[PDB]
Scaffold this active site. Structure first.
Site, PDB file in Angstrom:
ATOM      1  N   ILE A   1       0.803  -1.213   0.000  1.00 34.95           N
ATOM      2  CA  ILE A   1       0.000   0.000   0.000  1.00 34.95           C
ATOM      3  C   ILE A   1       0.839   1.267   0.000  1.00 34.95           C
ATOM      4  O   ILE A   1       0.304   2.338  -0.321  1.00 34.95           O
ATOM      5  CB  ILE A   1      -0.984   0.024   1.188  1.00 34.95           C
ATOM      6  CG1 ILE A   1      -0.246  -0.143   2.519  1.00 34.95           C
ATOM      7  CG2 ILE A   1      -2.047  -1.062   1.030  1.00 34.95           C
ATOM      8  CD1 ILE A   1      -1.177  -0.296   3.719  1.00 34.95           C
ATOM      9  N   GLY A   2       2.115   1.202   0.343  1.00 36.00           N
ATOM     10  CA  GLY A   2       2.921   2.409   0.392  1.00 36.00           C
ATOM     11  C   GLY A   2       4.378   2.123   0.111  1.00 36.00           C
ATOM     12  O   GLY A   2       4.879   1.024   0.375  1.00 36.00           O
ATOM     13  N   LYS A   3       5.064   3.124  -0.434  1.00 35.29           N
ATOM     14  CA  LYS A   3       6.500   3.084  -0.649  1.00 35.29           C
ATOM     15  C   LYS A   3       7.109   4.366  -0.100  1.00 35.29           C
ATOM     16  O   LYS A   3       6.400   5.324   0.221  1.00 35.29           O
ATOM     17  CB  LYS A   3       6.853   2.914  -2.136  1.00 35.29           C
ATOM     18  CG  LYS A   3       6.499   4.116  -3.005  1.00 35.29           C
ATOM     19  CD  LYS A   3       7.184   4.038  -4.361  1.00 35.29           C
ATOM     20  CE  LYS A   3       6.889   5.277  -5.198  1.00 35.29           C
ATOM     21  NZ  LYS A   3       7.588   5.268  -6.519  1.00 35.29           N
TER      22      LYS A   3
ATOM     23  N   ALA B   1      11.097   6.218   1.677  1.00 38.31           N
ATOM     24  CA  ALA B   1      12.494   6.120   2.082  1.00 38.31           C
ATOM     25  C   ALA B   1      12.680   5.104   3.200  1.00 38.31           C
ATOM     26  O   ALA B   1      13.710   4.425   3.260  1.00 38.31           O
ATOM     27  CB  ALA B   1      13.005   7.494   2.509  1.00 38.31           C
ATOM     28  N   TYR B   2      11.696   4.999   4.098  1.00 35.43           N
ATOM     29  CA  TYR B   2      11.745   4.027   5.186  1.00 35.43           C
ATOM     30  C   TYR B   2      11.854   2.600   4.662  1.00 35.43           C
ATOM     31  O   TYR B   2      12.532   1.758   5.262  1.00 35.43           O
ATOM     32  CB  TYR B   2      10.491   4.180   6.051  1.00 35.43           C
ATOM     33  CG  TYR B   2       9.224   4.306   5.226  1.00 35.43           C
ATOM     34  CD1 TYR B   2       8.744   5.553   4.838  1.00 35.43           C
ATOM     35  CD2 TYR B   2       8.522   3.180   4.814  1.00 35.43           C
ATOM     36  CE1 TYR B   2       7.596   5.672   4.071  1.00 35.43           C
ATOM     37  CE2 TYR B   2       7.376   3.290   4.045  1.00 35.43           C
ATOM     38  CZ  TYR B   2       6.914   4.538   3.678  1.00 35.43           C
ATOM     39  OH  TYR B   2       5.770   4.646   2.917  1.00 35.43           O
ATOM     40  N   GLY B   3      11.202   2.319   3.538  1.00 36.20           N
ATOM     41  CA  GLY B   3      11.024   0.971   3.043  1.00 36.20           C
ATOM     42  C   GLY B   3       9.692   0.876   2.331  1.00 36.20           C
ATOM     43  O   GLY B   3       9.377   1.731   1.498  1.00 36.20           O
ATOM     44  N   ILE B   4       8.889  -0.137   2.652  1.00 34.91           N
ATOM     45  CA  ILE B   4       7.562  -0.282   2.074  1.00 34.91           C
ATOM     46  C   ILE B   4       6.560  -0.543   3.193  1.00 34.91           C
ATOM     47  O   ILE B   4       6.924  -0.788   4.343  1.00 34.91           O
ATOM     48  CB  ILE B   4       7.498  -1.397   1.008  1.00 34.91           C
ATOM     49  CG1 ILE B   4       7.847  -2.752   1.618  1.00 34.91           C
ATOM     50  CG2 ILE B   4       8.439  -1.087  -0.140  1.00 34.91           C
ATOM     51  CD1 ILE B   4       7.669  -3.906   0.659  1.00 34.91           C
ATOM     52  N   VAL B   5       5.279  -0.461   2.837  1.00 35.73           N
ATOM     53  CA  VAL B   5       4.168  -0.693   3.753  1.00 35.73           C
ATOM     54  C   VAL B   5       3.177  -1.615   3.059  1.00 35.73           C
ATOM     55  O   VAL B   5       2.703  -1.299   1.958  1.00 35.73           O
ATOM     56  CB  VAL B   5       3.470   0.613   4.170  1.00 35.73           C
ATOM     57  CG1 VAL B   5       2.297   0.316   5.101  1.00 35.73           C
ATOM     58  CG2 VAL B   5       4.455   1.561   4.828  1.00 35.73           C
TER      59      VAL B   5
ATOM     60  N   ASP C   1       6.715  17.943  12.450  1.00 34.79           N
ATOM     61  CA  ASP C   1       6.587  17.854  10.998  1.00 34.79           C
ATOM     62  C   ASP C   1       5.164  17.404  10.649  1.00 34.79           C
ATOM     63  O   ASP C   1       4.916  16.268  10.252  1.00 34.79           O
ATOM     64  CB  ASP C   1       7.635  16.908  10.401  1.00 34.79           C
ATOM     65  CG  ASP C   1       7.617  16.892   8.880  1.00 34.79           C
ATOM     66  OD1 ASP C   1       7.046  17.825   8.274  1.00 34.79           O
ATOM     67  OD2 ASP C   1       8.184  15.951   8.287  1.00 34.79           O
TER      68      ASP C   1
END
Length: 356
Positions: A38-40, A42-46, A158
């Site tokens: 569902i998400g991409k 800098a942290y990685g993916i979700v 932030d």
């Protein structure tokens, strides 16, 4: 969409590795297939996943190589401890911390959050219409969560539209605390005036500022203060709000004070004329939120009682956090192995079966 993503049982069947375009996504066995990326970022993916033991749906974010740069390790541990300390309907909750299959080889951290449908940034991008009651509900929930966060002596440093997750129910939760403050120490379209012109200490007003921006972006569907460059941010700020008079300039550093006298004048363009479609009370509170002076900026406590939210405002229903939050998790100076160990104990708290 099962068997669309290959899923291999690993480590004696206690884990499952999911191949995601060459990205190995290893989670505990209870999260049986299928999973939905569902998400991409800098942290990685979700990915989204289902806990077969609790029939509950989560969003597993994978921070890869979380312990390499000690700064990022501190932001991860800070995220976990901060989000675990708080219990509030407008704060995203952690539902699980995955244990590492091998403690010696513990490089990726998988956090599982409660699953949300979208975020306000996507709502803006998709150009979809919202009743005024919906916008009201969103702003009210943002401020209602900010009241709690600040009441725990924490400043979410932030705030962005992508930081506000939504549901079909229109429930709104704040997330991504990787940069929050304990008063003891990245796009700036939402950064406060005092943050750019360094006043080394800042209060909750910064958050309020961002909220203002966000709400205008929710009501105008255009970024309020788009920055071509860092210096330009202030330009588009005072072009709209006006260059302050020094009854308002007193607070910033005198290395920064001089700065504001350095530029040509700027008139206070009226917001009711630039953005006239929006309701009047909305424009009122938005203007009361974007004051250049921090001590002249409306408090979240008072912004809750402003007449735009009078059909939702309620002091008995907007709680505070009783126990404050301390920044020295164990001690002040930690190595990557200590932070590793803390996150490991957290994962073992969510997964007592892996303690032994």
């Amino acid at each position: 969409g099962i068997e669309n993503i290959p899923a291999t049982l690993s480590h004696g069947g206690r884990f499952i590795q999911y191949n995601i375009f060459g990205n190995i996504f290893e989670v505990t066995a209870k999260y049986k297939p299928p999973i939905m990326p569902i998400g991409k970022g800098a942290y990685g993916i979700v990915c989204s996943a289902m806990n077969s033991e609790t029939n509950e749906s989560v969003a597993i974010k994978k921070i890869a190589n979380a312990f390499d740069n000690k700064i990022d390790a501190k932001r991860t541990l800070r995220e976990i401890k901060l989000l675990r300390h708080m219990d509030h309907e407008n704060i995203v909750a952690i539902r699980d911390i995955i244990p590492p299959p091998l403690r010696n080889a513990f490089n990726d951290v998988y956090i599982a959050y409660e699953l949300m449908d979208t975020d306000l940034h996507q709502i803006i991008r998709s150009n979809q219409a919202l009743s005024e009651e919906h916008c009201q509900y969103f702003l009210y929930q943002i401020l209602r969560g900010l009241k709690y966060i600040h009441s725990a002596n924490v400043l979410h440093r932030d705030l962005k539209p992508s930081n506000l997750l939504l549901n079909a129910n229109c429930d709104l939760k704040i997330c991504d605390f990787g940069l929050a403050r304990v008063t003891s120490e990245v796009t700036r379209w939402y950064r406060a005036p005092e943050l750019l012109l360094n006043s080394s200490d800042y209060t909750a007003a910064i958050d309020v500022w961002s909220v203002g921006c966000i709400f205008m972006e929710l009501m105008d569907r255009k970024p309020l203060f788009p920055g071509r460059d860092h210096v330009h941010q202030l330009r588009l700020l005072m072009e709209l709000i006006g260059t302050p008079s020094e009854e308002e300039l007193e607070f910033l550093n005198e290395n920064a004070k001089r700065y504001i006298r350095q530029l040509p004048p700027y008139p206070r363009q009226s917001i009711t004329d630039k953005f006239p479609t929006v309701h009047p009370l909305a424009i009122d509170l938005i203007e009361k939120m974007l004051t250049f002076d921090p001590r002249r900026r409306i408090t979240v406590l008072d912004a809750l009682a402003h007449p735009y939210l009078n059909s939702l405002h309620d002091i008995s229903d907007e709680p505070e956090c009783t126990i404050p939050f301390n920044f020295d998790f164990e001690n002040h100076a930690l190595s990557e192995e200590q932070m590793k160990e803390l996150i490991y104990r957290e994962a073992l708290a969510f997964n007592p079966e892996y303690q032994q």
